[PDB]
């Protein structure tokens, strides 16, 4: 049944979940991957069809920006990603994973469940700000609304996106900055967690939600501990136009790097 699957996705964590899809079936979503394999490459919007998505509601039954992504795949990938997670489990900049095997139709399909991710990832934000189209900007509007950058009526303005007709949009974009900067800090933790665990892998923007956690260990190979290496060449470089558009480092002008504290004299 699709309800017992929901109960297992809830797990030991006290979570109230509602299915973003329907009937223990994968939810298909148009996302913004940064991919490179033997056949395809590039920073493009693909259509992912490998994850069952559930949305959490806080009591009072309001839907919040926290999702349980229950990607199902082959068993060897399940075991390998379970081991890589058990190596990287203790890092705080790692999404919470739950590994189980659920009898879907007549077979025990192995599912991995990433808990309390956001709706969009850092790749979606970077793509929305790097491939901007004012006629088709719905992920940028949703990202700005869901993180209290604006009030969802700010887009009723004629040219809200224009930098020279509405300079106030800068003030809106800077409201993402502290959310971006924390993500950066999370990366520096995750890299460390790889380096001390001996895990080699490429860091991509689509494996990090807007909170900052990391959840994709499929193409991570482990070496001797203390000598791993994260490849962050494409991660940081694609992010660079966003680190000044959102003014991510404005918290560095304050004493003790706290936005509430006064500026450094
Ligand atoms: C360029 C980068 C660093 C260069 C280096 O000198 N590393 C030091 C030695 C690595 N070890 C084997 C020890 C090399 C080193 C080994 C890595 C690749 C491996 O196939 C594993 C994995 C297979 C997947 O299908 C696709 C991704 C992976 C991560 C690959 C990508 C990339 O190519 C890596 C990071
Ligand atoms: N054809 C496929 N069907 C299902 N899962 C796949 C397929 N190809 C790759 N995967 C898995 O998906 C992962 C990459 O998919 P991705 O869209 O990043 O999902 P996520 O980022 O949520 O893990 C890889 O680690 C791999 O294990
Ligand atoms: Mg991924």
UniProtKB/Swiss-Prot annotation:
Subunit comment: Interacts with nsp7 and nsp8 to form the replication-transcription complex (RTC): nsp12, nsp7, two subunits of nsp8, and up to two subunits of nsp13. Interacts with nsp9.
Domain NiRAN: from-to ranges: 5-259
Protein name: RNA-directed RNA polymerase nsp12
LRR repeats: 197-222
Cofactor: Mg(2+)
Organism encoding this protein: Severe acute respiratory syndrome coronavirus 2 (2019-nCoV)
Function, as annotated: RNA-directed RNA polymerase that catalyzes the transcription of viral genomic and subgenomic RNAs. Acts in complex with nsp7 and nsp8 to transcribe both the minus and positive strands of genomic RNA. The kinase-like NiRAN domain of NSP12 attaches one or more nucleotides to the amino terminus of NSP9, forming a covalent RNA-protein intermediate that serves as transcription/replication primer.
Residues reported to bind Mn(2+): 207, 216
Reaction(s) catalysed by this chain's protein: RNA(n) + a ribonucleoside 5'-triphosphate = RNA(n+1) + diphosphate; a 5'-end diphospho-ribonucleoside in mRNA + GTP + H(+) = a 5'-end (5'-triphosphoguanosine)-ribonucleoside in mRNA + diphosphate
Regulation: Inhibited by Remdesivir antiviral drug (GS-5734) through non-obligate RNA chain termination.
């Amino acid at each position: 049944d699709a309800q017992s699957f929901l109960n297992r996705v809830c797990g030991v964590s006290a979570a109230r979940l509602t299915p973003c899809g329907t009937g223990t079936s994968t939810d298909v979503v148009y996302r913004a991957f940064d991919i490179y394999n033997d056949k395809v490459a590039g920073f493009a919007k693909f259509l992912k069809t490998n994850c069952c998505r559930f949305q959490e509601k806080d009591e009072d039954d309001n839907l919040i920006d926290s999702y349980f992504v229950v990607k199902r795949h082959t068993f060897s990938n399940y075991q390998h990603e379970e081991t890589i997670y058990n190596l990287l489990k203790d890092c705080p900049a790692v999404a919470k994973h739950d590994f189980f095997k659920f009898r879907i139709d007549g077979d025990m399909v192995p599912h991995i469940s990433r808990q309390r991710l956001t709706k969009y990832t850092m790749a979606d934000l970077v793509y929305a700000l790097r491939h901007f189209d004012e006629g088709n900007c719905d992920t940028l509007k949703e990202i700005l609304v869901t993180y209290n950058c604006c009030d969802d009526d700010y887009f009723n303005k004629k040219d809200w996106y224009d930098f020279v007709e509405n300079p106030d949009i800068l003030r809106v974009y800077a409201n993402l900055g502290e959310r971006v900067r924390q993500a950066l800090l999370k990366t520096v933790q995750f890299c460390d967690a790889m380096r001390n665990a001996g895990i080699v892998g490429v860091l991509t923007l689509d494996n990090q939600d807007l909170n900052g956690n990391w959840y994709d260990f499929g193409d991570f190979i482990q070496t001797t501990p203390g000598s791993g290496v994260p490849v962050v060449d494409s991660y940081y470089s694609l992010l660079m136009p966003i680190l000044t558009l959102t003014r991510a480092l404005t918290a560095e002008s304050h004493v003790d790097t706290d936005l509430t504290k006064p500026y450094i004299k």
